[PDB]
Amino acid sequence: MLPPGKPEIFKCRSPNKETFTCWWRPGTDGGLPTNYSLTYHREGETLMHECPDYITGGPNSCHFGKQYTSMWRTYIMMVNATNQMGSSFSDELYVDVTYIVQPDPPLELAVEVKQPEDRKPYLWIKWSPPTLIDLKTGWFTLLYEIRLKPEKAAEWEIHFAGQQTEFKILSLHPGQKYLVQVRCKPDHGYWSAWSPATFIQIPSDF
């Protein structure tokens, strides 16, 4: 017997400035929705559009593929929740892809001990960028950070790696085991999640 409560578009993110996805949550204290319709328009146009892809971002999401996504242009969007008894519209959300960039974590983190001659030995860390990020044209710029800690230490040590995909760490405690992670952010935007940990035993001979 109740129409839906007021839905809310609570997050949008772009992993690579080429596509983005937005997510909404149903309102509580209304009836159950049997449909949602997300519509929007863009700054400097009057045309109204509907969400082009309700499937790819999973539940309660709108995914905007490349032909629907551009930078430096505000999207003004709204989701309506409907059932047999009526309907409810979210507040309008003003979103610009330029400011919601958050990459996926880096890939293939690998770590190695290296012991050369008459030169300090080091821990050698390597990784790869997330896939589908266009770095080689300069469309996208990625920065990285590593953290590492042995078990039970109260603090992480953090090392800024700038744009490199490899890094050398010198001052490790001989015989200690380290958890190592890497994350990345655009030049302008949010940090990714930390990648899964890789583990490395630093040898006694150090």
Partner 1 sequence: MLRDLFDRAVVLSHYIHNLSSEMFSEFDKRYTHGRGFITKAINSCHTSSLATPEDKEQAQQMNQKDFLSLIVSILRSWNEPLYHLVTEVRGMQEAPEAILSKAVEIEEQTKRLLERMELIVSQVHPETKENEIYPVWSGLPSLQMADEESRLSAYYNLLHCLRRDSHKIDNYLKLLKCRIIHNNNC
* Contacting residues toward partner 1, per CB under 8 A: 17-18, 43-44, 66, 69-74, 76, 94, 96, 98, 134-139, 141, 187-188
**Looking up tokens 């008894």, which residue turns up?**
85
Of the two residues 21 and 181, which places its CB atom closer to Na ion in the complex? 21
Instruction: Report the candidate in 66, 69, 15, 35 with the shortest Cα–Cα distance to residue 24.
Output: 35
Instruction: Report the candidate in 69, 123, 70, 106 with the shortest Cα–Cα distance to residue 183.
Output: 106
Pairing of strands 107-114, 86-89: unpaired
Of the two residues 70 and 83, which places its CB atom closer to partner 1 in the complex? 70
Size of the site for Na ion (CB under 5 A): 7
Q: Which does 119 bind (CB under 5 to 8 A by kind): Cl ion, partner 1, Na ion, none?
A: none
Q: Determine the Cα–Cα distance for residues 196 and 105; give it in Å rounded to an integer.
A: 9
Min. distance of Cβ 18 from Cl ion in angstroms? 20
Min. distance of Cβ 63 from Na ion in angstroms? 6
Give residues with Cβ within 8 angstroms of 148, minimum separation 6: 156, 157, 159, 169, 178, 179, 180, 181
The verdict on 191 binding Cl ion (CB under 5 A) reads yes
From the list 4, 17, 19, 23, which residue makes contact with Na ion (rule: CB under 5 A)?
A: 19
Burial letters 75-102, b for 16+ CB under 10 A, else e: bebbbbbbbeeeebebeebebebeebbb
Q: Which stretch binds Cl ion (CB under 5 A): 36-44, 80-88, 173-181, 190-198?
A: 190-198
Min. distance of Cβ 104 from Na ion in angstroms? 10
Min. distance of Cβ 17 from partner 1 in angstroms? 8
**Residues tagged in the binding site annotation for Zn(2+):** 187-188
